[PDB]
Amino acid sequence: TALVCDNGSGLVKAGFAGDDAPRAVFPSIVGRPRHQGVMVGMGQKDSYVGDEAQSKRGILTLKYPIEHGIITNWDDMEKIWHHTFYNELRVAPEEHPTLLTEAPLNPKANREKMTQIMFETFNVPAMYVAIQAVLSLYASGRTTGIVLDSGDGVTHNVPIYEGYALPHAIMRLDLAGRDLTDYLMKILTERGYSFVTTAEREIVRDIKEKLCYVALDFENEMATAASSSSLEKSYELPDGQVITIGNERFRCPETLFQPSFIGMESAGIHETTYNSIMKCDIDIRKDLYANNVMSGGTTMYPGIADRMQKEITALAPSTMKIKIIAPPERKYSVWIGGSILASLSTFQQMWITKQEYDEAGPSIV
Template identity: 60%
Template sequence: MVGMGQKDAYVGDEAQSKREAPLNPKANREKMTQIIGRTTGIVLDSGDGVSHTVPIYEGYALPHAILRLDLAGRDLTDSLMKILTERGYMFTTTAEREIVRDMKEKLAYVALDYEQELETSKSSSSVEKNYELPDGQVITIGAERFRCPEVLFQPSLIGMEAAVVAPPCSPGIADRMSKEITALAPSSMKIKVVAPPERKYSVWIGGSILASLSTFQQMWISKGEYDESGPSIVHRKCF
C-alpha cells in the first residue's frame, strides 16, 4: 500500500539501481533516465489470479479509476493445458499443472499480429520449440506458444466477455500492448509502453524502496495506535 502522508517526500526521492545489458546503447540509457523521473502513467499488473490497471497521477493512485479483471496467469496455464490436448499431451494433476506453468513461462510469447502468426505456424515449423519433461521425455509445441497468451486480448477464446486490462511477463507483450492502445487512443497522443525485465518482482522492489525511506516511518502502524483505534487505523495510515 502507498502511504497517504508527505507524498512529495518519497515520490522520486529514493535511490534507484538499474540493470542493463553489456554494450547497452546510449539511446537506451537516455530513455531509461527519462522514464525513471515520471510520476504519471498507468500501471498494468497481472498476477496469478487477477489483473488490475491502476492510473497514477503525480505519484497518486486514482482509486475511482482502478479496474479489475479475474483473468490472469492461472487462466493462461489452464488454457495451455487445454490446447495441448490437441497434440495428444494430457496434463491433469496439480504437479502436471506446474509443469505446464513452467512451459508457459519459458516458451510462450505474445504475437504482434495473431492471425498472421497463426497462418505462419500452419505453413512453417519456425515457431516450434522442444520442452523436456521431468522424466526426460521431450515434447514439441508450436502455435500453442502464442495461442495461450492471446486470451489476454481475446477473452472470448476461453468464454469470457470482458477485455483484458493487464499484461503478463510473456515476450512481445510491450509491442502488442503498444499496438492495441495506439489503435484506441487519439492520434495526437503518444503511447509508450514500458515492460522492464524485472517486472515480475516490481511489487516487492517498490515496497522495499518505500519501506526503507525515512519519511515512511510515520506511516507504520504501532501496537499502541492499533490498541487505541482498532483495525480502522489502517484507513488513516494507508490507502
C-alpha cells in the same frame, strides 16, 4: 531493518527494507495430508506451506488462500505469514515493523483483517499495507502514469495522477495466470499429450514461462504456424518424452487480449487500458499513456510490450503518445517500490504503530 511483503495468489515476496532483492519468495499454498502420518526425523505437521507444500504436493491436497488479488481465507494466510517471518526470514516479528502489499481497490474489512492479525498474532511493533500497482510505479521512478499489474489471479489498470490512484477508473479483469495455465494445459492436450495432475499444472506454467510468446500479430502467425514447423519448440518433460509446442505458444498468452477464447464477454487488456482512461481526465490522459508501466507475473512474456503499444496505437485520443514500460525486473517491482519507501528516513510517520493499534483498533488501516 523493517519488513516488506508482497503477497499474491501464487506468489509471496518478502524481506527487509532496502534489500535490493527479496528474502522470502514463495508460493502461497497451504497443503493438507491425504493421510495421518509421520515418517522419520520430524514429527507430524498439520499443513505444509510454500516450498514445503510444493515438495509435499503428491501426499497433499494444495490450497491457495488469495484469489483474484483478495485474501479469501485468513486461516491459510496466517500459516503463510508464519512461513515468512519465522521460516524464510528467520527472525522474530517482535523487533520488526512490517509492510504487506494490497490489491488496487481492496474492501475495508480485508485490509483491517491484515491489521488485526499482524498486530495480534505476529505482534509486530509497526505495520503498513500498500497498494501493488502504485508501488510498482514508484519503483519505476514515476508519479503519474498507468500500470498494468497482472499475476496468477488478477490484472489491474490503475491510472495515477501525482502519487494518487483514480479509483473510479480501475479495471480489475479476472483473467490472468491461473486462467492462462489451465488453458495452456487444455491446448497442449489439444495438441496431443495427456496431462493429468496439479503437478502437471507446474509443467504447463513452466512451458508458459519458457517457450511462450505474446503473438506479435495473431493472424500472420497462424498462417506461418500452419505452413512450417519453424515455430515449434521441443520440450523435455521430466519423463524424457520430448514433446512439441507450436501454435499454442501464442494461443495461450493471447487470452489476455481476447477473453473470447476461454469464456468471458469482457474486453481484452488493450481495451481495458484504453477504456479506463476514457473514465479519466483528458489533460492527464497524455501523462498516463506517456508512461504505461507493467508488473506482476503475467506481464513477463515475450512480445507483450511490443504488442501493448501497437494494439492500442489505433485507439487513444489524438495527441496521446504511448510508451509501455515493462521494467525487466518487473515481478519484484512492487517490492522494490515497497523496500525503498519503507527504508525512507521520511517514512517513520507513515507506518501504523502497535500503539496506534492498541489505542484505536483495526479501522486505522
